[PDB]
């Protein structure tokens, strides 16, 4: 009878380009039938990597804390790679198989020169993806990326996929999601991860 979970999910989108990773997430913390907050950060950073969370916010926060603790222990010798971090996250998630974390985690970062984005389910399975969306708005945004960015079903010549073009496509997708997704938030927090650093930007979404 007891429900251990709360669906605070808005929408998060992670896209890896040839030389950059664009992470965007809505800042709304949704209750049932209401809005707890409009300025909660769904994106956490672990060194040069950005962790993206959805689903139950407490579960994702606990998973991020466990990841940070394990990475801190591991870093006694050397910095952890994005692949090792993704595998560790998968193991941590699966350890809760009978009481899963309700959080779709997307781990993204650079392994030296090459960008990598990893998408996880609630039971820990992780895939290396080119563009992934999680949360209630995932079906409203993923087709847009499949079409405009991944150029699925694009029979003709493809518009060149540059960083600014992808960022504008992400803002378009979040506008559409916030329009038709009830729980997609009021502000979109966009990160750009490059080889040597990363930077945050904020943009506004409709605030119904």
């Amino acid at each position: 009878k007891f429900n251990p979970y709360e669906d605070n999910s808005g929408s998060t989108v992670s896209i890896r380009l040839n030389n950059s990773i664009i992470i965007a997430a809505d800042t709304r913390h949704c209750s049932e039938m209401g809005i707890y907050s409009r300025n909660t950060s769904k994106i956490f950073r672990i060194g040069d990597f950005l962790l993206t969370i959805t689903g139950f916010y407490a579960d994702g926060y606990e998973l991020y804390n466990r990841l940070k603790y394990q990475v801190q222990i591991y870093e006694s010798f050397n910095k952890i790679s994005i692949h090792s971090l993704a595998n560790l996250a998968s193991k941590i998630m699966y350890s809760k198989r009978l009481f899963p974390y309700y959080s779709y985690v997307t781990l993204s970062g650079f392994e030296g020169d090459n960008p990598y984005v990893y998408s996880f389910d609630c039971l820990g399975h992780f895939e290396e993806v080119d563009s992934v969306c999680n949360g209630s708005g995932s079906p409203l945004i993923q087709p847009l990326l499949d079409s405009t960015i991944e150029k699925k079903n694009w029979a003709g010549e493809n518009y060149e996929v540059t960083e600014e073009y992808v960022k504008d496509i992400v803002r378009r997708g979040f506008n559409a999601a916030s329009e038709r997704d009830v729980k997609t938030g009021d502000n979109v927090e966009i990160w750009i991860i490059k080889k040597d650093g990363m930077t945050k930007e904020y943009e506004r979404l409709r605030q119904d």
Binding site: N3, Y5, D7, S9, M33, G34, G55, F56, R97, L98, P100, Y102, Y104, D121, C122, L123, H125, S136
Partner: protein, 60 residues
């Protein structure tokens, strides 16, 4: 406990997909009458029967 995740993916079904869905945690345009979960009209505010014996109704 494990949730039978992937049973529909694993068997021909003669909706447990491969990846866990948020639903595990109708075609009518229906809105909520009140935000309260399943309430849409005033409560039945009488004095409600308690006690007695519902196990032996006929032992008046």
């Amino acid at each position: 406990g494990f949730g039978n995740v992937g049973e529909d993916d694993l068997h021909p079904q003669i909706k447990k997909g491969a990846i866990f869905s948020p639903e595990e945690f109708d075609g009518i345009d229906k809105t909520d009458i009140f935000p309260l979960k399943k309430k849409r009209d005033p409560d039945s505010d009488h004095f409600k029967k308690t006690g007695g014996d519902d196990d032996n109704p006929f032992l008046y």
